[PDB]
């Protein structure tokens, strides 16, 4: 399948080459994988998510996303025209409140969630998680997020945006989960993204167009919107039988586009997300 005039994001994914704007991929695209958005909440009625989303567990006063981070991240999952994955199932896990913030309590506590939730939600071609946030290390919330792995879930996490060694944030710094850096569209290190010996994988996560709140759109950047690139990936190659939650990182490595990025630090990872899709 072919979708014209992609973000620039989906095409990069889909790409050897940067430059170009049509994203490729298998029309399974994701059917029968489930992909949890764990951050501010994901706004369901979004046409964009065409009846594919829910929320499934809050930790504040309302399951709404209040602040659209989590909205932008779940489009960039799987929504119609901004998503990797355009058939997935998404669930949307609210541990962080309307401004962005949340207490690590709470972010161990979704996790853990989502570790038993997945059996009680139909994901025959596998389970992905999506935490776009962190703060400093913390032991505790990398055993949180090395639970949720273990439990047979493919995590994909954000490194960081303090362009600093990611080594030092959690969950970034769990080395059993999947470490994503964010890259831009002339296939440069995005200026703010961490770095370090413990991501395992880059991502477009400069000027990513996704959903918002009040059923809109809008550009944003992190290493946030580099993340559900991953994790959208994922469940695209598991729903196609090429991996497992187990090893879908590692996948993503051994067949990422390699040697392609720009101020990649010495000691880091030059490989970017790439699907190897051939119509």
Known sequence: ?????????????????????????????????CVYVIDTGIEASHPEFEGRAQMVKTY???????????????????????????????????????????????IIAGMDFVASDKNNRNCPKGVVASLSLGGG??????????RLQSSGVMVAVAAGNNNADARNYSPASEPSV???????????????????????????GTDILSTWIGGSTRSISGTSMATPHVAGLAAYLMTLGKTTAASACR????TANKGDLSNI???????????????
């Open 60 to 106: 504040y006063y309302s399951s709404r996303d209040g602040n659209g981070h989590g909205t932008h991240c779940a489009g960039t999952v799987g929504s119609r025209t901004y998503g990797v994955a355009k058939k997935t199932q998404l669930f949307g896990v609210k541990v962080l409140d309307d401004n962005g913030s949340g207490q690590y309590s709470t």
């Open 251 to 254: 996948y993503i490595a051994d």
């Open 137 to 146: 290390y913390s032991s505790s919330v990398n055993s949180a997020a090395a």
């Open 265 to 279: 630090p010495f000691g880091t990872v030059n490989l970017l997300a790439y699907n190897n899709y051939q119509a």
């Open 1 to 33: 399948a072919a979708q014209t005039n992609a973000p620039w994001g989906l095409a990069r994914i889909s790409s050897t080459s940067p430059g170009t704007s049509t994203y490729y991929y298998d029309e399974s695209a994701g059917q029968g994988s």
């Open 178 to 204: 999947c470490t994503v850096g964010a890259s831009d569209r002339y296939d440069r290190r995005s200026s703010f993204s961490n770095y370090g010996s413990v991501l395992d994988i880059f991502g477009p």
